[PDB]
Design a protein around this motif. Structure first.
Motif, PDB file in Angstrom:
ATOM      1  N   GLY A  68      30.217  39.467  35.359  1.00  0.00           N
ATOM      2  CA  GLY A  68      28.798  39.801  35.414  1.00  0.00           C
ATOM      3  C   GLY A  68      28.326  41.240  35.279  1.00  0.00           C
ATOM      4  O   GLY A  68      27.181  41.477  34.869  1.00  0.00           O
ATOM      5  N   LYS A  69      29.188  42.198  35.603  1.00  0.00           N
ATOM      6  CA  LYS A  69      28.821  43.605  35.532  1.00  0.00           C
ATOM      7  C   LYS A  69      29.430  44.361  34.366  1.00  0.00           C
ATOM      8  O   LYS A  69      29.348  45.587  34.312  1.00  0.00           O
ATOM      9  CB  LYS A  69      29.161  44.316  36.850  1.00  0.00           C
ATOM     10  CG  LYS A  69      30.608  44.248  37.278  1.00  0.00           C
ATOM     11  CD  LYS A  69      30.829  45.191  38.434  1.00  0.00           C
ATOM     12  CE  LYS A  69      32.237  45.088  38.958  1.00  0.00           C
ATOM     13  NZ  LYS A  69      33.186  45.197  37.834  1.00  0.00           N
ATOM     14  N   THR A  70      30.088  43.655  33.452  1.00  0.00           N
ATOM     15  CA  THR A  70      30.678  44.337  32.298  1.00  0.00           C
ATOM     16  C   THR A  70      29.675  44.224  31.144  1.00  0.00           C
ATOM     17  O   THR A  70      29.323  43.123  30.744  1.00  0.00           O
ATOM     18  CB  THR A  70      32.043  43.695  31.887  1.00  0.00           C
ATOM     19  OG1 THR A  70      32.952  43.706  33.004  1.00  0.00           O
ATOM     20  CG2 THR A  70      32.655  44.450  30.690  1.00  0.00           C
ATOM     21  N   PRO A  71      29.181  45.355  30.616  1.00  0.00           N
ATOM     22  CA  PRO A  71      28.210  45.343  29.509  1.00  0.00           C
ATOM     23  C   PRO A  71      28.784  44.758  28.221  1.00  0.00           C
ATOM     24  O   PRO A  71      29.948  44.973  27.925  1.00  0.00           O
ATOM     25  CB  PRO A  71      27.891  46.828  29.319  1.00  0.00           C
ATOM     26  CG  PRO A  71      28.168  47.432  30.655  1.00  0.00           C
ATOM     27  CD  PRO A  71      29.443  46.734  31.059  1.00  0.00           C
ATOM     28  N   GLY A  72      27.969  44.010  27.473  1.00  0.00           N
ATOM     29  CA  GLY A  72      28.406  43.419  26.213  1.00  0.00           C
ATOM     30  C   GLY A  72      29.672  42.585  26.314  1.00  0.00           C
ATOM     31  O   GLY A  72      30.488  42.517  25.384  1.00  0.00           O
ATOM     32  N   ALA A  73      29.826  41.905  27.439  1.00  0.00           N
ATOM     33  CA  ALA A  73      31.008  41.118  27.649  1.00  0.00           C
ATOM     34  C   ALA A  73      30.874  39.685  27.196  1.00  0.00           C
ATOM     35  O   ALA A  73      29.784  39.095  27.206  1.00  0.00           O
ATOM     36  CB  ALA A  73      31.402  41.160  29.102  1.00  0.00           C
ATOM     37  N   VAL A  74      31.985  39.161  26.700  1.00  0.00           N
ATOM     38  CA  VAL A  74      32.042  37.765  26.322  1.00  0.00           C
ATOM     39  C   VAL A  74      33.035  37.147  27.305  1.00  0.00           C
ATOM     40  O   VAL A  74      33.696  37.848  28.096  1.00  0.00           O
ATOM     41  CB  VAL A  74      32.400  37.519  24.827  1.00  0.00           C
ATOM     42  CG1 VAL A  74      31.243  37.984  23.950  1.00  0.00           C
ATOM     43  CG2 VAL A  74      33.663  38.250  24.428  1.00  0.00           C
ATOM     44  N   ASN A  75      33.090  35.836  27.297  1.00  0.00           N
ATOM     45  CA  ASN A  75      33.939  35.127  28.217  1.00  0.00           C
ATOM     46  C   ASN A  75      34.688  34.062  27.423  1.00  0.00           C
ATOM     47  O   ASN A  75      34.395  32.873  27.543  1.00  0.00           O
ATOM     48  CB  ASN A  75      33.013  34.514  29.261  1.00  0.00           C
ATOM     49  CG  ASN A  75      33.735  33.720  30.295  1.00  0.00           C
ATOM     50  OD1 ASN A  75      34.956  33.791  30.431  1.00  0.00           O
ATOM     51  ND2 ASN A  75      32.974  32.940  31.045  1.00  0.00           N
ATOM     52  N   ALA A  76      35.642  34.503  26.598  1.00  0.00           N
ATOM     53  CA  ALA A  76      36.414  33.599  25.749  1.00  0.00           C
ATOM     54  C   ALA A  76      37.231  32.568  26.498  1.00  0.00           C
ATOM     55  O   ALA A  76      37.438  31.463  25.995  1.00  0.00           O
ATOM     56  CB  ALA A  76      37.288  34.372  24.773  1.00  0.00           C
ATOM     57  N   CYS A  77      37.693  32.895  27.693  1.00  0.00           N
ATOM     58  CA  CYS A  77      38.455  31.919  28.453  1.00  0.00           C
ATOM     59  C   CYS A  77      37.535  30.968  29.209  1.00  0.00           C
ATOM     60  O   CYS A  77      37.990  29.982  29.783  1.00  0.00           O
ATOM     61  CB  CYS A  77      39.381  32.620  29.434  1.00  0.00           C
ATOM     62  SG  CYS A  77      40.725  33.511  28.621  1.00  0.00           S
ATOM     63  N   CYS A  95      44.378  31.244  30.390  1.00  0.00           N
ATOM     64  CA  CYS A  95      43.615  32.317  29.757  1.00  0.00           C
ATOM     65  C   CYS A  95      44.534  33.233  28.938  1.00  0.00           C
ATOM     66  O   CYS A  95      44.163  33.697  27.857  1.00  0.00           O
ATOM     67  CB  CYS A  95      42.830  33.101  30.812  1.00  0.00           C
ATOM     68  SG  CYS A  95      41.716  34.392  30.151  1.00  0.00           S
ATOM     69  N   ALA A  96      45.737  33.478  29.448  1.00  0.00           N
ATOM     70  CA  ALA A  96      46.718  34.285  28.730  1.00  0.00           C
ATOM     71  C   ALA A  96      47.043  33.595  27.387  1.00  0.00           C
ATOM     72  O   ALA A  96      47.192  34.264  26.357  1.00  0.00           O
ATOM     73  CB  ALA A  96      47.972  34.417  29.555  1.00  0.00           C
ATOM     74  N   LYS A  97      47.172  32.264  27.404  1.00  0.00           N
ATOM     75  CA  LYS A  97      47.461  31.503  26.178  1.00  0.00           C
ATOM     76  C   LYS A  97      46.324  31.694  25.164  1.00  0.00           C
ATOM     77  O   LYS A  97      46.559  31.803  23.946  1.00  0.00           O
ATOM     78  CB  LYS A  97      47.641  30.012  26.497  1.00  0.00           C
ATOM     79  CG  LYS A  97      48.959  29.673  27.186  1.00  0.00           C
ATOM     80  CD  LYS A  97      49.019  28.200  27.522  1.00  0.00           C
ATOM     81  CE  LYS A  97      50.357  27.834  28.097  1.00  0.00           C
ATOM     82  NZ  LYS A  97      50.400  26.387  28.463  1.00  0.00           N
ATOM     83  N   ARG A  98      45.092  31.734  25.675  1.00  0.00           N
ATOM     84  CA  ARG A  98      43.909  31.945  24.834  1.00  0.00           C
ATOM     85  C   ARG A  98      43.968  33.333  24.180  1.00  0.00           C
ATOM     86  O   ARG A  98      43.760  33.467  22.975  1.00  0.00           O
ATOM     87  CB  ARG A  98      42.618  31.770  25.669  1.00  0.00           C
ATOM     88  CG  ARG A  98      41.305  32.130  24.955  1.00  0.00           C
ATOM     89  CD  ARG A  98      41.116  31.352  23.642  1.00  0.00           C
ATOM     90  NE  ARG A  98      40.007  31.886  22.849  1.00  0.00           N
ATOM     91  CZ  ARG A  98      40.106  32.894  21.983  1.00  0.00           C
ATOM     92  NH1 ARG A  98      41.274  33.467  21.731  1.00  0.00           N
ATOM     93  NH2 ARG A  98      39.031  33.301  21.325  1.00  0.00           N
ATOM     94  N   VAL A  99      44.309  34.356  24.957  1.00  0.00           N
ATOM     95  CA  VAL A  99      44.390  35.717  24.425  1.00  0.00           C
ATOM     96  C   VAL A  99      45.334  35.809  23.225  1.00  0.00           C
ATOM     97  O   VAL A  99      44.972  36.398  22.197  1.00  0.00           O
ATOM     98  CB  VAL A  99      44.869  36.736  25.497  1.00  0.00           C
ATOM     99  CG1 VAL A  99      45.179  38.101  24.856  1.00  0.00           C
ATOM    100  CG2 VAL A  99      43.826  36.875  26.593  1.00  0.00           C
TER     101      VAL A  99
END
Length: 130
Positions: A68-77, A95-99
């Motif tokens: 929530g506090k990271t600017p321009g952040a996406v949440n791919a996982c 999530c590591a597998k997603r990366v």
């Protein structure tokens, strides 16, 4: 939770990390070792860009999880960064597998390039029964 070496090695194998997207288990162990020292509660704030790295694999809040506090952040996982701080590493593993499904693969983590790439990583899994 701070995992013991072989304990983590066996857990990762059970979660299907061995050979995931061509990445051997010893490479995942080398990464966890250098990123957090096998510590699931490890967090590191990057003052330079306002993002935070979370958990055992030190996954970044700008691209992978939401804090929530990271600017321009996406949440791919599609996870709260809080999920990456649990003792049960199942979510962090997913999530590591997603990366690594991105073109860079394991190279996404600079520490892997510095401490693991082109090195003898057998030591991380030796004697663990995996």
């Amino acid at each position: 939770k701070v995992f013991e070496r072989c304990e983590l090695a066996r857990t990762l194998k059970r979660l299907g990390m061995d050979g995931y997207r061509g990445i051997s288990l010893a490479n995942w162990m080398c990464l966890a070792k250098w990123e957090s020292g096998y510590n699931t509660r490890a967090t590191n704030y990057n003052a330079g860009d306002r993002s935070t790295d979370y958990g055992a694999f030190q996954i970044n809040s700008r691209y992978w999880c939401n804090d929530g506090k990271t600017p321009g952040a996406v949440n791919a996982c599609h996870l709260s960064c809080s999920a990456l701080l649990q003792d049960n590493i199942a979510d962090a593993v997913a999530c590591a597998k997603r990366v690594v499904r991105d073109p860079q693969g394991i190279r996404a983590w600079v520490a892997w390039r510095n401490r693991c790439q082109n090195r003898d990583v057998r030591q991380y899994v030796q004697g663990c029964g995996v």
